[PDB]
Design an enzyme around this catalytic site. Structure first.
Site, PDB file in Angstrom:
ATOM      1  N   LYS A 183       0.841  -1.195   0.000  1.00  0.00           N
ATOM      2  CA  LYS A 183       0.000   0.000   0.000  1.00  0.00           C
ATOM      3  C   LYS A 183       0.878   1.249   0.000  1.00  0.00           C
ATOM      4  CE  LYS A 183      -4.086   2.097   2.164  1.00  0.00           C
ATOM      5  NZ  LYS A 183      -4.737   2.667   3.372  1.00  0.00           N
ATOM      6  N   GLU A 230     -10.008  11.775  11.848  1.00  0.00           N
ATOM      7  CA  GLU A 230      -9.214  10.612  12.196  1.00  0.00           C
ATOM      8  C   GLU A 230      -8.419  10.863  13.466  1.00  0.00           C
ATOM      9  OE1 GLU A 230      -7.151   8.778   9.024  1.00  0.00           O
ATOM     10  OE2 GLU A 230      -6.367   7.129  10.255  1.00  0.00           O
TER      11      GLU A 230
HETATM   12  C1  LIG Z   1      -5.458  10.866   3.214  1.00  0.00           C
HETATM   13  C2  LIG Z   1      -6.738  11.048   3.565  1.00  0.00           C
HETATM   14  O1  LIG Z   1      -7.559  10.026   4.113  1.00  0.00           O
HETATM   15  C3  LIG Z   1      -7.062   8.834   4.747  1.00  0.00           C
HETATM   16  C4  LIG Z   1      -7.911   8.515   5.978  1.00  0.00           C
HETATM   17  C5  LIG Z   1      -9.399   8.289   5.691  1.00  0.00           C
HETATM   18  C6  LIG Z   1      -9.753   7.834   4.260  1.00  0.00           C
HETATM   19  C7  LIG Z   1      -8.595   7.276   3.424  1.00  0.00           C
HETATM   20  C8  LIG Z   1      -8.870   6.385   2.172  1.00  0.00           C
HETATM   21  O2  LIG Z   1      -9.934   5.759   2.081  1.00  0.00           O
HETATM   22  O3  LIG Z   1      -8.029   6.289   1.246  1.00  0.00           O
HETATM   23  C9  LIG Z   1      -7.171   7.696   3.692  1.00  0.00           C
HETATM   24  O4  LIG Z   1      -6.404   6.527   4.154  1.00  0.00           O
HETATM   25  C10 LIG Z   1      -7.380  12.413   3.343  1.00  0.00           C
HETATM   26  O5  LIG Z   1      -8.551  12.635   3.748  1.00  0.00           O
HETATM   27  O6  LIG Z   1      -6.753  13.329   2.732  1.00  0.00           O
END
Ligand SMILES: C=C(O[C@H]1C=CC=C(C(=O)O)[C@@H]1O)C(=O)O
Ligand SMILES: [Mg+2]
EC number: 5.4.4.2
Length: 378
Positions: free
Chosen positions: A134, A184
């Site tokens: 990832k 988060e």
């Molecule tokens: C990097 C971000 O989200 C992270 C955390 C929640 C959703 C995410 C996703 O689904 O890719 C990302 O891991 C952002 O909101 O800019």
């Protein structure tokens, strides 16, 4: 009345406060800040005693730490702080009437759609291989306006549109303001107890509470996102093993919302050693595979060769800790850096073998729209 741009503000279901003044700035990089023998912590603890001695009761340390903890930190102890009621502030903000008329004179996507899709393609490809599983890739929107941007009025708008999130407003050494509505939680510590609530995986919300209540359930099923999510949780499991006395982790995630997105969340609840405070644990966890990738150091390297900018404070953590091991830290996303008439927005995804570039381009677009709505743009 609105908040002055040289005050820290933090709005949380845990502790919500403002700050006044600046007793001492704290630039020290936070690398290896997870061990208390670190320069970061010795300096941190040095400065807290400095502050208490010098007459400050209950010093707090506030600010942001950048994605790359080698780069320097934007922390500082205020001369004072002042609790406020989260629910009280939600209500005043929803009534705050008077806004600022702003004229944009330049808006730049950095990069634009096509270059981003090629970066998503070249990154997904490398996850298929044994080199990484990832990587998170991000993009930016740069906005130039024809008058200085009122940080306080913007913060009222952000609270009104984002009542529930960890809302922050950080003064920077350059005179700017880092500002956002993070969903988060990276690390809470309340006495001996600690939690982290990583997100990973997303879907648009819908106006109609029928297609909305199910676009979510889809998220709960989609194997793309469920796999996105497990990489983050397994990694945080391993890292907390010998750092926490106890530790409970659900094996399946649950749904949570922002005004724009469904997300998958897994709550961590643990107890930690007296050897640890809010930042030693935050520095341990961050960045999780939700913001960098997995494996972590292998994924930083894809990010550097693919992203045409320096993230600086973006994808870092923002928050606080006190002199007594307590604090809260949230991931610096759904955010903007403001300074005079210039603004930079940030958003990242979320990249594994099964991700299509049109999908991740539009995913980051929806995430960017949190801060665009604050500005009154689409
Ligand atoms: C990097 C971000 O989200 C992270 C955390 C929640 C959703 C995410 C996703 O689904 O890719 C990302 O891991 C952002 O909101 O800019
Ligand atoms: Mg994603």
């Amino acid at each position: 009345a609105t908040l002055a741009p040289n005050r820290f503000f933090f709005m949380s279901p845990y502790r919500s406060f403002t700050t006044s003044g600046c007793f001492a700035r704290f630039d020290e990089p936070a690398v290896n800040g997870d061990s208390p023998d670190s320069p970061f912590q010795q300096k941190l603890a040095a400065l807290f005693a400095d502050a208490k001695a010098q007459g400050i009761k209950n010093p707090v340390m506030v600010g942001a730490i950048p994605f790359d903890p080698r780069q320097p930190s934007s922390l500082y102890i205020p001369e004072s702080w002042q609790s406020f009621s989260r629910q009280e502030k939600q209500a005043s903000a929803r009534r705050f009437t008077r806004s600022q008329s702003l004229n944009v004179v330049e808006r730049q996507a950095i990069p634009e759609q096509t270059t981003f899709e090629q970066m998503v393609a070249r990154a997904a490809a490398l996850t298929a291989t044994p080199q990484v599983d990832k990587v998170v890739l991000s993009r930016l929107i740069d906005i130039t306006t024809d008058a200085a941007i009122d940080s306080g009025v913007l913060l009222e708008r952000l609270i009104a549109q984002n009542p529930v999130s960890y809302n922050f407003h950080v003064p920077l050494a350059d005179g700017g303001v880092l500002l956002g509505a993070s969903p988060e939680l990276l690390l809470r510590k309340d006495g001996e107890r600690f939690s982290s609530i990583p997100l990973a995986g997303s879907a648009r919300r819908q106006p109609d509470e029928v297609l909305d209540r199910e676009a979510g359930n889809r998220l709960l099923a989609s194997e793309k996102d469920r796999h996105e999510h497990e990489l983050v949780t397994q990694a945080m499991k391993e890292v907390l093993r010998e750092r926490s006395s106890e530790l409970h982790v659900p094996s399946s995630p649950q749904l949570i919302t922002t005004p724009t997105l469904w997300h998958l969340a897994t709550p961590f609840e643990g107890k930690a050693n007296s050897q640890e405070n809010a930042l030693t644990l935050a520095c341990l966890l961050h960045p999780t595979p939700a913001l960098s990738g997995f494996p972590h150091q292998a994924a930083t390297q894809v990010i550097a060769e693919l992203e045409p900018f320096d993230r600086e404070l973006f994808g870092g953590i923002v928050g606080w800790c006190d002199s007594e091991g307590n604090g809260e830290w949230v991931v610096t996303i759904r955010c903007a850096k403001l300074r005079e008439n210039q603004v930079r927005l940030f958003a990242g995804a979320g990249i594994v073998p099964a991700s299509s570039p049109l999908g991740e381009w539009r995913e980051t677009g929806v995430k960017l729209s949190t801060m665009l709505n604050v500005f009154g743009l689409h």
